[PDB]
Curated annotation (Swiss-Prot):
The gene is FGFR4. Residues 15-300 form the Protein kinase domain. The chain holds residues 453 to 752 of 802 of the full protein. It comes from Homo sapiens. The modification Phosphoserine is found at S121. Residues 1-300 are cytoplasmic. This is Fibroblast growth factor receptor 4.
Length: 300
């Protein structure tokens, strides 16, 4: 069926499929054990994420997955993205094998690590000290920016950059996921709410939402939303605003308020990312540098 690319091809019998992790518009993701992903260590076990089609995919579903595979091949390797490890295309179902992030997505990461509430009785010397500190939050933002900077350099547009689409490793390294996806930009159900209550329309740049125009600067807009997510510790954007109201508010030029416990430096960058004119928004290179200054100034 598909042609053999020996550079990326990996023997499917060296995979042991484990627990299903979730799914997207096309295909599902399954945790798996891989043996000898590194050819120098043929019997070495590693944990990977395997992308595959659902139980009757159309050929469009297959074409979407193949298209994702080819994007993954060309983009290359970077510390702050989910990297391609190998593929299974011969004699069996199509597998796209990618890096597995131990701690799940950034949204759930932050929400599970919100500071202890006012109802918890003080127990020990760190009763007020939550898992999340400001410099770590800044580092999360900086890493995502560096990852997006890399993707931009490889002429890759994400088109749904959000905390949900950023994954966290065992060492709290941010890795941008699903950057090479066909996302059906000409038939988006703008009112669609996910099973976890997400309204993806709230991450779209105005030119993307209103004009169906995607550039790297539209990703920058989304990054601004992601910044807001980070410093609300996994909050949902435009709180209490349904999609219909979002439409009119965006047309009136409405912007989100400065969230609590968020320094002006970071709300400043959010607002810059939300400039009406895409050219007036910072580039990811500028975002990386701007965030780095803050990160260094607080990393004594
Ligand atoms: C193998 C490590 C692992 O199981 N990690 C993990 C545990 C629990 C929940 C998770 F979401 C993960 C995780 O992030 N798995 C994972 N590793 N690489 C991936 C690449 C894509 C992907 O997609 C699924 C659908 C997904 C996304 Cl994009 C975002 N949030 C959750 C999920 Cl399940 C998941 C992984």
């Amino acid at each position: 069926d598909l042609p053999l690319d020996p550079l990326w091809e990996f023997p499917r019998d060296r995979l042991v499929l484990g627990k299903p992790l979730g799914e997207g518009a096309f295909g599902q993701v399954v945790r798996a054990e891989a043996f000898g992903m590194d050819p120098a260590r043929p019997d070495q076990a590693s944990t990977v994420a395997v992308k595959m089609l659902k139980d009757n995919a159309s050929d469009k579903d297959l074409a979407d997955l193949v298209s994702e595979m080819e994007v993954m091949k060309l983009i290359g390797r970077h510390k702050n993205i989910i990297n391609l490890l190998g593929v299974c295309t011969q004699e069996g179902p199509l597998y796209v094998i990618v890096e597995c992030a131990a701690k799940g997505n950034l949204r759930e990461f932050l929400r599970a690590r919100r500071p202890p509430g006012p109802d918890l009785s003080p127990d020990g010397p760190r009763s007020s000290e939550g898992p999340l500190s400001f410099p770590v939050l800044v580092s999360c933002a900086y890493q995502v920016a560096r990852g997006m900077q890399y993707l931009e350099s490889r002429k890759c547009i994400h088109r749904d950059l959000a905390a949900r689409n950023v994954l966290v490793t065992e060492d709290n390294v941010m890795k941008i996921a699903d950057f090479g996806l066909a996302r059906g930009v000409h038939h988006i159900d703008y009112y669609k709410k996910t099973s976890n209550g997400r309204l993806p329309v709230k991450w779209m740049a105005p030119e993307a939402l209103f004009d169906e125009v995607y550039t790297h600067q539209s990703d920058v807009w989304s990054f601004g939303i992601l910044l807001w997510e980070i410093f609300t510790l996994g909050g949902s954007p435009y709180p209490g605003i349904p999609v219909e109201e979002l439409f009119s508010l965006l047309r009136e030029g409405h912007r989100m308020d400065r969230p609590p416990h968020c320094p002006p430096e970071l709300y400043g960058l959010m607002r810059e990312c939300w400039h009406a004119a895409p050219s007036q928004r910072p580039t990811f290179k500028q975002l990386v540098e701007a965030l780095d200054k803050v990160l260094l100034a607080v990393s004594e």
